């Protein structure tokens, strides 16, 4: 794999996992310190949700860096390297990111349940695909997961967007800016997976880990930076509970 075997354990991708760990930690601490001076009840909710996104990713990236939760999956004569913590991270952080968007939109808890449920199914079926032992199974689960993703993104771009519009220009503009990022950045994930080690195997583990790290840092720290600097986070919220 393209990279550098930092820990001397035969894993050049740890260069990228190490860089990712550091960036997630810096982002977490930045949001934490910024949050300490926040008093508004709504803004505190966005900070709490959003700090946890690179916070949990920090733990996942540190895990992966040290090789905790790394195993191999037999696919014919190949043994594909899978990091469980990548999927565990996404299982927690994608619902949190969607909750941020749902708070902005001020949508109801059944809408939120639908959104986060389909998102969880996306991650679970991606993991099933990653652990599957035939190409046909891996591609089939990938396709199912990708349909789940399209459903999530469609809901964001239609139902939640229309709800956010009613909340006035500040909230609408922030919702729209973040949704623009999400529709593009999230779609990059299935593309990378299917061209990478899990799918067609065009891209190797090194470049793939690098690019997932960039996507993860952008979709977490980048997203969070854009959200938390907006006046929209002062607007009234209704948590699902």
Ligand X SMILES: CC1=C(/C=C/C(C)=C/C=C/C(C)=C/C=O)C(C)(C)CCC1
Kindly list the residues in this chain that would bind ligand X in the complex (CB under 6 A): 90, 93-94, 97, 122-123, 126, 129, 142, 145-146, 149, 186, 189-190, 193, 216, 219-220
Compute the least distance from the CB of residue 65 to Na ion, in Å: 8
The one of Na ion, Ca ion, ligand X, none whose footprint includes residue 61, by CB under 5 to 8 A per kind, is: none
Map residues 103-142 to x or -, x wherever contact with ligand CCCCCCCCCCCC holds by CB under 6 A.
Answer: ----------------------------------------
Does 82 participate in binding ligand CCCCCCCCCCCC (rule CB under 6 A)?
no
Does 154 participate in binding ligand CCCCCCCCCCCC (rule CB under 6 A)?
yes
Does 38 participate in binding Ca ion (rule CB under 5 A)?
no
Please, which residue, 25 or 38, has the CB nearer to Cl ion? 38
Long-range CB pairs of 178-183, under 8 A, 24+ apart, other chains included: 178/100, 178/101, 178/104, 178/223, 178/226, 178/227, 179/101, 181/218, 181/219, 181/222, 181/223, 181/226, 182/97, 182/101, 182/153, 182/156, 182/219, 182/223, 183/153, 183/156, 183/157
Please, which residue, 15 or 17, has the CB nearer to ligand R16? 15
Please, which residue, 19 or 207, has the CB nearer to Cl ion? 207
Region near ligand R16 per CB under 6 A, out of 60-68, 85-93, 110-118, 198-206: 110-118
Residue 230 Rama label (left phi>0; alpha psi -120 to 50; beta): beta
Give residues in contact with ligand R16 (CB under 6 A).
4, 15, 19, 23, 26-27, 30, 108, 110-111, 114, 118, 136-137, 140-141, 143-144, 147-148, 150-151, 153-154, 157, 183-184, 187-188, 214, 217-218, 221-222
């Amino acid at each position: 794999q393209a990279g550098y075997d930092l820990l001397g354990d035969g894993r050049p991708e740890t260069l990228w996992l190490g860089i990712g760990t550091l960036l997630m930690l810096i982002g977490t601490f930045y949001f934490l310190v910024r949050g300490w001076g926040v008093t508004d009840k709504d803004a505190r909710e966005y900070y709490a949700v959003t700090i946890l996104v690179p916070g949990i990713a920090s733990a996942a990236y540190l895990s992966m860096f040290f090789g905790i939760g790394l195993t191999e999956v037999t696919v014919g004569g190949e043994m594909l390297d899978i990091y469980y913590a990548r999927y565990a991270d996404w299982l927690f952080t994608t619902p949190l990111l969607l909750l941020d968007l749902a708070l902005l939109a001020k949508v109801d808890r059944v809408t939120i349940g639908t959104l986060v449920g389909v998102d969880a199914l996306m991650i679970v079926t991606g993991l099933i695909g990653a652990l599957s032992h035939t190409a046909i199974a891996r591609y089939s689960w990938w396709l199912f997961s990708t349909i789940c993703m399209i459903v999530v993104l469609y809901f964001l771009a239609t139902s939640l967007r229309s709800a956010a519009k009613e909340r006035g220009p500040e909230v609408a503009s922030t919702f729209n800016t973040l949704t623009a990022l999400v529709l593009v950045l999230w779609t990059a994930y299935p593309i990378l997976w299917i061209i990478g080690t899990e799918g067609a195997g065009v891209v190797g583990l090194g470049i793939e880990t690098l690019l997932f790290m960039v996507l993860d840092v952008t979709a977490k720290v980048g997203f969070g930076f854009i959200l938390l600097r907006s006046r929209a986070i002062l607007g009234d919220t209704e948590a699902p509970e």
